[PDB]
Amino acid sequence: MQGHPEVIDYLNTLLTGELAARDQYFIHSRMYEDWGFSKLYERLNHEMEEETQHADALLRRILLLEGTPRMRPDDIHPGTTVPEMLEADLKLERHVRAALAKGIALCEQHKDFVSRDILKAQLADTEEDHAYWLEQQLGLIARMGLENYLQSQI
Amino acid sequence: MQGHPEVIDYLNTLLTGELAARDQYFIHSRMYEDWGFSKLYERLNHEMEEETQHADALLRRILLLEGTPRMRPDDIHPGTTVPEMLEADLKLERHVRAALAKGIALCEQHKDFVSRDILKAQLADTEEDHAYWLEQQLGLIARMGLENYLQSQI
Amino acid sequence: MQGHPEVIDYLNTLLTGELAARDQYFIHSRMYEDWGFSKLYERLNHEMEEETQHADALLRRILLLEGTPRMRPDDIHPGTTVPEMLEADLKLERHVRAALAKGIALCEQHKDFVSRDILKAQLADTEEDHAYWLEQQLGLIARMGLENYLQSQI
Amino acid sequence: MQGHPEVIDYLNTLLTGELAARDQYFIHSRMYEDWGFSKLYERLNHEMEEETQHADALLRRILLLEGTPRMRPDDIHPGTTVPEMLEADLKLERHVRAALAKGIALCEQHKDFVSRDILKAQLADTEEDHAYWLEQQLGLIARMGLENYLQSQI
Amino acid sequence: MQGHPEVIDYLNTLLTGELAARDQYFIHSRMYEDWGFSKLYERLNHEMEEETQHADALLRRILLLEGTPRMRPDDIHPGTTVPEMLEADLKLERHVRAALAKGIALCEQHKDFVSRDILKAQLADTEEDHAYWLEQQLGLIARMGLENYLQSQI
Amino acid sequence: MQGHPEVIDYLNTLLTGELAARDQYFIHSRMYEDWGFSKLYERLNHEMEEETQHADALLRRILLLEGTPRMRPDDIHPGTTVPEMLEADLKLERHVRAALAKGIALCEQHKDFVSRDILKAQLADTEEDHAYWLEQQLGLIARMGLENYLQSQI
Amino acid sequence: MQGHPEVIDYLNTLLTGELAARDQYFIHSRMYEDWGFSKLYERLNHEMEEETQHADALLRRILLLEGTPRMRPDDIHPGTTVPEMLEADLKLERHVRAALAKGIALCEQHKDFVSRDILKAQLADTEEDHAYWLEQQLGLIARMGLENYLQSQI
Ligand SMILES: [Fe+3]
Ligand SMILES: [Fe+3]
Ligand SMILES: [Fe+3]
Ligand SMILES: [Fe+3]
Ligand SMILES: [Fe+3]
Ligand SMILES: [Fe+3]
Ligand SMILES: [Fe+3]
Ligand SMILES: [Fe+3]
Ligand SMILES: [Fe+3]
Ligand SMILES: [Fe+3]
Ligand SMILES: [Fe+3]
Ligand SMILES: [Fe+3]
Ligand SMILES: [Fe+3]
Ligand SMILES: [Fe+3]
Ligand SMILES: [Fe+3]
Ligand SMILES: [Fe+3]
Ligand SMILES: [Fe+3]
Ligand SMILES: [Fe+3]
Ligand SMILES: [Fe+3]
Ligand SMILES: [Fe+3]
Ligand SMILES: [Fe+3]
Ligand code: NA
């Protein structure tokens, strides 16, 4: 079944964004482990796997719709300290959140309700899991101080 | 069996207080989780269930005594920071403690010994579990500082 | 992430409605047990737990969206006989149904698709589980008579 | 192996009748559940599966005999109340009974003994299981009254 | 340890009452079974065992207090129909309830707090289990009719 | 709860389409087995069960909405060779796909969000499971030839 | 421990190559599944995971050596048919093979023997697993024909 070209193009834009999110969590998780923060390594390694699944869902939907997937990831922007890396990931998730919400609206307009639902599942993950967790870590640093926070992530 | 109207009215006063305690722990536990303090979420979620059971015991006793339960909870008063929320819950438990002790005396006077015993079980829970735990948390903050305390509740 | 103030306000309206539904099933289930209808106690006790979960989902979503939850339950309106209690619960569920459907429309308009989906799950529960069951009980009374119906709920 | 055209045509007549029986039990079982009679839902759901198997046996035998199956179900005639639905199903089974018995005679005449045996198995099901059960339910209503009968099917 | 003679005498009054309650449930449970109401047999057989335990607790406490137990049961008053037997048992439990409450007051006055607690446990059983169940059965008869009620106790 | 007459009518149109899809897979699966292609029998037998479930979901939703289900299946159009049967099923699924998408739009317009979600689940099944599989089989025939494809389905 | 800048730079060149290999197998495996060749999907999905591990080993070694990893994948070059995709992957693995062998020589020269061993493990995987398997598939096509080969990969 041929998808609507505007939907296919927009899924491709989301795909390159998810491939980038995967890779930014790849580098951040391994940096966290290089510094000895294994709890941060574990969480971001887990988020890398989740973005890989998000990318996979979009890639397969594009193929089903007879489109050609775009595999070049967007540029990533890693931080250099724990607070910068948390902020840089939160900035990325907020961008993903906005892009997914715009996609859902586009899918509704072109009556592609299955692509809409695929994006909705990713939007819930983005808001309620990925972005929320980052906001909580930054909140914790604010409440107990960075040194105590870092101690808790060994 | 028709209870004494003064006892039934007083059980109803306690009931609306317990429904409120349940709801104040409902909001505080979820606020604690919103900030990433899962140990505080777990304890207050547990206390919400215990106040629900306290309310249930009073509600069933009122019905057994052929009274009509009052289901409007008292006003609650949530705090806005961890120390204010702990203090606000301790203030509420101290009020419950006083109200239960007054009820036990009333039940003795009207020779309703089973209602007295129901209140005594709740008074022990209030003093030795709920209020005591809150006093201990405030004590801990005083001894190690708020930042270290908050670190311990992640 | 800050939610849209109109969505947050509307989630708060639904929240106080769910807290009330929870409490109306609290009193009805215990009245049913006071009269010896344990099958009605069991079903409405189960519905009380489900409304507690509905309230919990709304409360957590409001906090995630950086809003302040409103914890005062709406007024409840218990019946005094089995048919009045069934009708009073069906009236409440029909109100919840309308309020949720209005909320879904509002969430679509403000492009809050995750809040929309949370409400949709509750709307399905309301229509296909809660309200439908009540309609069936009233239907049964109509088909076999109230006395036979009550016999079946011991 | 090419079957006798008169046998193949008659198997096709039975097939469209069985597809209809399946569909009449489909709608009746779901109506029974819509009204809260789960024991009637369960029995008629089971009968729908049995008619599906009856249709399947005829369909496969027609193909084996190198015929082309007729897949249009006969018209169905659902009732609007429990007694009308029971009577409407009993009327249908009596028609099936007569049609199968006529088929067995035809199969004997054309010396198609395996098709005869397939019909005999369905005739036993029709008389001793499907029609008999319906006669018993109508008999029960006559002996204890419809209201008591309906109570028993919750 | 010698108990207070007024407490010992009053425990003896309760003892002969409990021995009678045991025997009234002995005859009623067996009458219920003679008529084919096995659910009523089971409940009252269970209540006979509970009154036997109530009597046993009083008997042992009297001996501990160096008193001599009075083993003559009070007169019993069995009914002749299911409603009369339920009413006759409810009348007896209400008498026991009053007698236990008077005993608790006497025990408090003579500072026999362990005998008081023994009576309190029996008072809770009497109000919340024995008398309450009887009130519920009479309530059920009132709501569905005696014939439907009796059907439910086969 | 009374559904909107336009939604109920449209659910009925989908229902008769699903009953037909069920029956077209009924005949195709059994034809595939008659020719010795057991892997094709297994897949289409499975699809027959899935369309039966799709029909069941629509039928129950129509009853819940106080409508009367239409049980006459649409005409079916079986093929006479493996390629014609695959094409005929793909044609049917494409029709179902379009009809479901039109229904979702109608349900949104009449604010029946639960019926919308029921249709969305079926649309995902139709696009991503049923139609996609058929497209893949036709694709395989194109890539390896019909004879090799048929060999693989024994 | 600070690595030699020439070794770190060369590990970074290999890293971007491995991230690309991962992504080329990502798209090819999903294309193979889109066409119904599940055995090819499974093998290339497995190779994607192996290149992810190869990239991970290089990334961690670069961090250990106090370098900054380069996360931009090299351009990929997917084929459009099964033979082109196999050839395109074999071309990539041959490039990786040459690059790893050049790296081992560089590591020996700068006396970084642990980085050398990490590359040697990847070189064995590349030659004896990845490239060899691709050569075998192309060989199979040559020996039995493409149509028979494709049949075998369903
Ligand atoms: Fe994502
Ligand atoms: Fe994300
Ligand atoms: Fe997760
Ligand atoms: Fe309490
Ligand atoms: Fe408390
Ligand atoms: Fe506890
Ligand atoms: Fe609800
Ligand atoms: Fe509800
Ligand atoms: Fe449920
Ligand atoms: Fe049949
Ligand atoms: Fe039949
Ligand atoms: Fe059977
Ligand atoms: Fe007793
Ligand atoms: Fe007793
Ligand atoms: Fe007991
Ligand atoms: Fe379907
Ligand atoms: Fe389908
Ligand atoms: Fe499936
Ligand atoms: Fe590699
Ligand atoms: Fe490789
Ligand atoms: Fe391997
Ligand atoms: Na009856």
In DSSP notation, C68-108 reads -----PPP----SSHHHHHHHHHHHHHHHHHHHHHHHHHHH
- CA-closest candidate to residue F58, choices F109, F130, F3: F3
Interhelix angle B5-34/B82-109, rounded to 10 degrees, is 170
> Is G28 exposed, middle or buried (CB count within 10 Å of its CB: 0-12, 13-18, 19+)?
buried
d(CA E23, CA A41): 73
d(CA E144, CA C148): 7
Q: How many residues appear in chain E? A: 154
Which pair of tokens denotes residue F56? 């069941």
> Is B149 exposed, middle or buried (CB count within 10 Å of its CB: 0-12, 13-18, 19+)?
buried
Which letter does DSSP use for residue B127 in this model? Answer: I
Is G19 in the A-facing interface, judged by CB distances under 8 Å?
Answer: yes
d(CA A120, CA A74): 21
Answer yes or no: is G75 a known binding residue.
Answer: no
F112 alpha-carbon distance from chain centroid? 23
To test the contact with chain C by mutation, choose from D32, D35, D81 the residue with the greatest count of C C-beta atoms within 10 A, namely D35
Query: E strand or H helix at G53, and its extent?
Result: helix G38-64
d(CA G152, CA G154): 6
Q: Which residue has the tokens 């870590």?
A: A137
CA distance F124 to chain A (A): 6
Query: HSE (CB half, 13 Å, CA atoms) of E62?
Result: 21
d(CA E40, CA E31): 9
Is E140 in the C-facing interface, judged by CB distances under 8 Å?
Answer: yes
d(CA C136, CA A102): 42
d(CA G135, CA G28): 16
- Which one-letter amino acid corresponds to residue A76? I
Answer yes or no: is A87 a known binding residue.
Answer: no
- CA-closest candidate to residue E11, choices E55, E50, E76: E55
d(CA G73, CA G100): 17
Which pair of tokens denotes residue C7? 């969505």
- CA-closest candidate to residue D34, choices F103, C145, F1, C95: F1
**Residue A40: which region, alpha, beta or left (left: phi > 0; alpha: psi -120 to 50)?**
alpha
**Contact between chain E and chain A (3 or more Cβ pairs less than 8 Å apart):** no
Question: Which residues 6+ apart lie within 8 Å of D19 measured at CB?
Answer: D51, D55, D71, D72, D73, D74, F23
**Residue F12: which region, alpha, beta or left (left: phi > 0; alpha: psi -120 to 50)?**
alpha
Which pair of tokens denotes residue B117? 């015993």
Say if the Cβ atoms of F111 and C97 lie within 8 Å: no
Q: What are the Cα distances from residue A98, in Å, to A15, A70, G64?
A: 14, 20, 36
d(CA C79, CA C73): 18
The SS3 assignment for C138 reads helix
Which letter does DSSP use for residue E71 in this model? Answer: -
Q: What are the Cα distances from residue A48, in Å, to A42, A87, E139?
A: 10, 16, 63
- Are residues B1 and E131 in contact, defined by beta-carbon separation less than 8 angstroms? yes
Which pair of tokens denotes residue B5? 């109207």
Sign of the alpha-carbon torsion through G13, G19, G20, G21 = positive
Which pair of tokens denotes residue G1? 């421990």
Q: Which of E105, E127, E135 sits opposite B114 (nearest CB)?
A: E127
Question: Which residues 6+ apart lie within 8 Å of A61 measured at CB?
Answer: A11, A114, A115, A118
CA distance A25 to chain F (A): 30
d(CA C144, CA E108): 55
Q: What are the Cα distances from residue G154, in Å, to B24, C11, E131, F134?
A: 60, 51, 74, 14
Q: How many residues appear in chain B? A: 154
Interhelix angle F82-109/F113-124, rounded to 10 degrees, is 160
Which pair of tokens denotes residue E62? 């009297």
- CA-closest candidate to residue A58, choices A100, A111, A106: A100
Q: Please calculate the CA angle F62-F67-F68 and round it to the nearest 5 degrees.
A: 95
How far, in Å, from the CA of E89 to the mean position of ligand 17? 66
> Is A36 exposed, middle or buried (CB count within 10 Å of its CB: 0-12, 13-18, 19+)?
exposed
Exposure string for A74-106, b = 16+ CB within 10 A, e = fewer: bebebbeebeebbebbbebbbebbebbbebbeb
Neighbouring C-beta atoms of residue E34, cutoff 10 Å? 9
- Which of chain C's residues have a Cβ under 8 Å away from the Cβ of A123? 113-114
Window C:43-62, CB contacts with A under 8 Å: none
F94 alpha-carbon distance from chain centroid? 9
Interhelix angle D38-64/F5-34, rounded to 10 degrees, is 40
d(CA E112, CA E62): 12
Q: What are the Cα distances from residue F51, in Å, to B16, C21, E38, F16, F48?
A: 52, 37, 49, 11, 5
The SS3 assignment for D128 reads helix
Which pair of tokens denotes residue D106? 């035809």
Question: Which residues 6+ apart lie within 8 Å of C15 measured at CB?
Answer: C55, C58, C59, C62, C69, C70, C71
Which pair of tokens denotes residue E152? 């439910």
d(CA A95, CA A13): 12
d(CA A10, CA D143): 69
Say if the Cβ atoms of F71 and D26 lie within 8 Å: yes
Exposure string for G57-95, b = 16+ CB within 10 A, e = fewer: bbbebbbebebebbbbbbebebbeebeebbebbbebbbe
Q: Which residue has the tokens 């834009």?
A: A13
Q: Which of C137, C144, C151 sits opposite D150 (nearest CB)?
A: C144
Which pair of tokens denotes residue C56? 């919990």
> Is F22 exposed, middle or buried (CB count within 10 Å of its CB: 0-12, 13-18, 19+)?
buried
Is C35 in the E-facing interface, judged by CB distances under 8 Å?
Answer: yes
Which letter does DSSP use for residue E111 in this model? Answer: T
| Residue C39 backbone dihedrals phi, psi, to 5 degrees | -70, -35
Exposure string for A37-70, b = 16+ CB within 10 A, e = fewer: beebbebbbebbebbbebbbbbbbbbbbbebebb
Which letter does DSSP use for residue D4 in this model? Answer: P
Answer yes or no: is D4 a known binding residue.
Answer: no
- Which one-letter amino acid corresponds to residue E129? D
d(CA C111, CA C88): 34
Sign of the alpha-carbon torsion through A130, A132, A136, A139 = positive
CA distance B152 to chain C (A): 23
- Are residues C57 and C69 in contact, defined by beta-carbon separation less than 8 angstroms? no
Q: Long-range contacts made by residues E20-24, C-beta under 8 angstroms, separation at least 24? A: E20/E73, E20/E74, E20/E75, E20/E76, E20/E92, E21/E51, E21/E54, E21/E92, E21/E93, E21/E96, E22/E48, E22/E51, E22/E52, E22/E55, E22/E73, E23/E73, E23/E76, E24/E76, E24/E77, E24/E78, E24/E88, E24/E89, E24/E92
Question: Which residues 6+ apart lie within 8 Å of D151 measured at CB?
Answer: C144, C148, C149, C151, C152
Say if the Cβ atoms of C143 and D150 lie within 8 Å: yes
CA distance A15 to chain F (A): 19
- Are residues A114 and F120 in contact, defined by beta-carbon separation less than 8 angstroms? yes
- CA-closest candidate to residue E106, choices E120, E95, E93, E94: E120
- CA-closest candidate to residue D54, choices D129, D112, D132: D129
Q: What are the Cα distances from residue C97, in Å, to E11, G20, G90?
A: 60, 51, 60
- Are residues D11 and D115 in contact, defined by beta-carbon separation less than 8 angstroms? yes
d(CA G88, CA G121): 23
Which pair of tokens denotes residue B103? 């009820």
Which pair of tokens denotes residue C10? 């509307």
Question: Which residues 6+ apart lie within 8 Å of F31 measured at CB?
Answer: D63, F78, F85
- CA-closest candidate to residue A95, choices A112, A77, A113: A77
d(CA B39, CA A152): 14
What is the SS3 string spanning G54-75?
HHHHHHHHHHHCCCCCCCCCCC
**Contact between chain F and chain E (3 or more Cβ pairs less than 8 Å apart):** no
Instruction: Write down all domains in chain C, each with its CATH number in brackets.
Output: 1-154 (1.20.1260.10)
Question: Which residues 6+ apart lie within 8 Å of D84 measured at CB?
Answer: none
The SS3 assignment for G2 reads coil
How far, in Å, from the CA of A123 to the mean position of ligand 3? 13
d(CA D106, CA D121): 16
- Are residues G55 and G19 in contact, defined by beta-carbon separation less than 8 angstroms? yes
d(CA B123, CA B130): 10
Q: Which of F136, F137, F148 sits opposite G147 (nearest CB)?
A: F148
For chain G, helix, strand, coil in percent to 5 are 80, 0, 20
Which pair of tokens denotes residue D65? 């005999």
Which pair of tokens denotes residue B116? 């007295």
Is F2 in the C-facing interface, judged by CB distances under 8 Å?
Answer: no
The SS3 assignment for A3 reads coil
Please tell me which residue of chain A has the smallest CA distance to G65: A34
Beta-carbon contacts below 8 Å between B and C: 51
d(CA C78, CA B71): 10
Neighbouring C-beta atoms of residue F139, cutoff 10 Å? 15
Breaks (C-N over 2.5 A) in chain D follow: none
- Are residues B17 and B96 in contact, defined by beta-carbon separation less than 8 angstroms? yes
